[PDB]
Amino acid sequence: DVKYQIWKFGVIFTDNSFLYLGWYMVMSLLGHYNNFFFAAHLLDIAMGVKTLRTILSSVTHNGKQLVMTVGLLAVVVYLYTVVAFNFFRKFYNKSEDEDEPDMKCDDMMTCYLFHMYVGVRAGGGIGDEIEDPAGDEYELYRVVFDITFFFFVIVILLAIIQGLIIDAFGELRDQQEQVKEDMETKCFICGIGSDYFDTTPHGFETHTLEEHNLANYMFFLMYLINKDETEHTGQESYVWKMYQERCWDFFPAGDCFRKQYEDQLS
Amino acid sequence: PYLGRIEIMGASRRIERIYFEISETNRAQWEMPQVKESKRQFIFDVVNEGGEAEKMELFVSFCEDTIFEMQIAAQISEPFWGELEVQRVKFLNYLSRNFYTLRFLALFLAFAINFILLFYKVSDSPPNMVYYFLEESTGYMEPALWCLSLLHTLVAFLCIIGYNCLKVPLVIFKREKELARKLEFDGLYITEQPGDDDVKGQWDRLVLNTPSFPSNYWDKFVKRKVLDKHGDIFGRERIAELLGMDLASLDVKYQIWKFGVIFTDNSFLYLGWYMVMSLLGHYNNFFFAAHLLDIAMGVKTLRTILSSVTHNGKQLVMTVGLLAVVVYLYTVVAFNFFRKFYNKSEDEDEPDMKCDDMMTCYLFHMYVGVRAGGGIGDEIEDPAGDEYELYRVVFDITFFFFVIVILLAIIQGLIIDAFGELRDQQEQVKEDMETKCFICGIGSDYFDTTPHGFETHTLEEHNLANYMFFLMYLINKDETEHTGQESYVWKMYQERCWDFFPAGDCFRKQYEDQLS
Ligand SMILES: Nc1ncnc2[nH]cnc12
Ligand SMILES: Nc1ncnc2[nH]cnc12
Ligand SMILES: [Zn+2]
Ligand SMILES: [Zn+2]
């Protein structure tokens, strides 16, 4: 079937894992051309090691927020660049030579590039990086500029990323705790709380290992699929018909054998 | 489909079910995404900062606001004096319906103008006052900038007009409704007479005698109701002269009051500031670079991230003041003992001591000591080879710990804690909505006795959407056409008594004996 083969090839080519393996092979081939291409395979540890994958998920959890805050940092640095370009052209000079001074804020693009390059990567704002403001009429304006840069651009806008990562670690930990506690406290299939089952000793364990085991439900489903039709019992035919009609009423919800027949079981 | 179900505490003091008809247009207004967002915000706010006593009050207020919003949406939606009036109202409706698209276009224009301005250059010679010129080889970007600035100012003007024609009615309706409630059920201007500490009350005092006081609020009989309620105490003639009513027969002032209200309105003020800076861009183009911060009010994720830091603005101000105080204390300590070291001049002829003056030493500390990564000792003269070695090393180390590490880690801790508290707020509101019924408060554990019990109860029996639809149905339906239960609920609503809302009870709890 040529059409089916074409469709299958399209599906597998769209598949992400197959695409990743194809890229792995392409870089492996290009290593033969330029050996250093084999140094790009070392990042496969991210997809390989489970703990590394979890740690990287801790930061990719808030990738959208990180992009948003980086855009906010770019916006505020551009605003400070405009503020500097309009008033403080003198100070951004990096050339000691008097014959050919190098002013790094005459051009708007150049001043923005200078800010994005060195002002953020400096530990004390831009005032510590560029010409000293003392002995000038704009002393107060420029010290306010430098201090506001230090607070709003370095402290807060590089602590937001750390807060985002810490919060992501926390939210992941609470997700794991919540799923574990929910599994411990409730029956997955029926939803009845464990407090009822703990009336008798080991009641919840017995219920979840003998009565409402999801593994047992899956085994029953595969048993129905494997067993030839017209060989089903009445209950098996009922469940098979429900499955073919895709109606999940047969799954017990809020009820169980003990709840149904406690009058005779007690 | 178009059938609504509710449960009330009827006159027989038992839970009773009421059926009514829901319109297709109203339903479409309900699943409108703007109304969905408003509902989400209302649920979050009430669950997070609302008690059970006033919860029904807040719910009814939100229902009334939503009803007014859908009425305005239906009004503006569309499926020589007369012709010009028709054209004008059509244009106003178009602006009202496309306010959000115009705002997005304004943001795009701001980004485009800023990007074009990113090719600014300075040249002393014409292309000591410098002649500013924009450098580019293509040649069309200057006319592009001029056209973009004109079109952006136009877009801002249409945005303000659309806001005035769309969202101002909500503010006017809310203010008039609150004034009517405080006049009737509280007698704020009859007995209480606020002690000049409520500027809002003083401003609303003007509109009392206006003829068309209930312009948007539906209850036009507020004057008659308050007169009937407070006659025997105040005086019929004095109530009539206070309210402007023609007792014997039983708007410039209103326009001024409305203008004052809209001018006080924060969103209108922000849009006015946007237009002012857009105009001042024509004077000095770099004023268009101040519109780029509109992304904070524009993008939802940016707004949430900025709320994460504005949550503790008071605490951040307090800790910055504490940092200023401690740096001043260290400045005093240095000024009294360590004047030698704060020298930044290598030249021996003219040494520059930066701690002889108290103001100068404080400025030096606030400027460089905090922004240094290793305290002030790494920034100023080395302490070795001196008698004050121990004192100065203790000074530097205490500065490093108390001023740089702790007092710049407090801000990071505050931001992290704010992120955490916001996350727990969202988790708590979601879990409360999942585990309890909003209207009645009965836990979900009872309803999960039968399969899908809680879902059926919250989608058929106690749906807040159904309650809002019933309330708007009562408002729309003409009086003297109400059924007995409808008249009962209407009377309760007019008396502002929320006993009819089921609290801690439901139809299943009431009649399980026959339902089982
Ligand atoms: N029904 C169930 N089967 C297996 N593990 C469970 N954990 C909780 N409920 C369970
Ligand atoms: N009564 C109710 N209506 C709609 N959503 C709900 N979530 C919880 N209770 C609800
Ligand atoms: Zn179970
Ligand atoms: Zn309920």
From Swiss-Prot, chain A:
Phosphoserine carried by residues: S95
Annotated residues for binding of ATP: M183, E184, T185, K186, C187, F188, T208, L209, E210, E211, H212, N213, L214
Other comment: Binding of [3H]ryanodine indicates that the heterozygous channel is activated by Ca(2+) concentrations 4-fold lower than normal. Single-cell analysis of cotransfected cells shows a significantly increased resting cytoplasmic Ca(2+) level and a significantly reduced luminal Ca(2+) level.
Record note on domains: The calcium release channel activity resides in the C-terminal region while the remaining part of the protein constitutes the 'foot' structure spanning the junctional gap between the sarcoplasmic reticulum (SR) and the T-tubule. Pore opening is mediated via the cytoplasmic calcium-binding domains that mediate a small rotation of the channel-forming transmembrane regions that then leads to channel opening.
Physiological role: Cytosolic calcium-activated calcium channel that mediates the release of Ca(2+) from the sarcoplasmic reticulum into the cytosol and thereby plays a key role in triggering muscle contraction following depolarization of T-tubules. Repeated very high-level exercise increases the open probability of the channel and leads to Ca(2+) leaking into the cytoplasm. Can also mediate the release of Ca(2+) from intracellular stores in neurons, and may thereby promote prolonged Ca(2+) signaling in the brain. Required for normal embryonic development of muscle fibers and skeletal muscle.
Intramembrane stretches listed in the entry: 109-128
Binding site for Ca(2+): T230
Subcellular localization(s) per the UniProt record: Sarcoplasmic reticulum membrane
Tissues/organs with expression: Detected in skeletal muscle (at protein level). Fast- or slow-twitch skeletal muscle.
Post-translational modification: The N-terminus is blocked.
UniProt-reported outcome of changing I126T: Loss of channel activation by halothane and caffeine due to Ca(2+) store depletion, probably due to constant Ca(2+) leakage through the mutant channel
Spans through the membrane: 9-31, 33-49, 65-85, 149-169
Residues with the Phosphotyrosine modification: Y92
Motif position, Selectivity filter: 123-129
Complexes and interactors: Homotetramer. Can also form heterotetramers with RYR2. Identified in a complex composed of RYR1, PDE4D, PKA, FKBP1A and protein phosphatase 1 (PP1). Repeated very high-level exercise decreases interaction with PDE4D and protein phosphatase 1 (PP1). Interacts with CALM; CALM with bound calcium inhibits the RYR1 channel activity. Interacts with S100A1. Interacts with FKBP1A; this stabilizes the closed conformation of the channel. Interacts with CACNA1S; interaction with CACNA1S is important for activation of the RYR1 channel. Interacts with CACNB1.
Spans within the Lumenal topological domain: 32, 86-108, 129-148
Cytoplasmic side: 50-64, 170-266
Record-stated family: Belongs to the ryanodine receptor (TC 1.A.3.1) family. RYR1 subfamily.
Organism of this sequence: Oryctolagus cuniculus
Name of the molecule in the record: Ryanodine receptor 1
Whole sequence portion shown: 4772 to 5037 of 5037
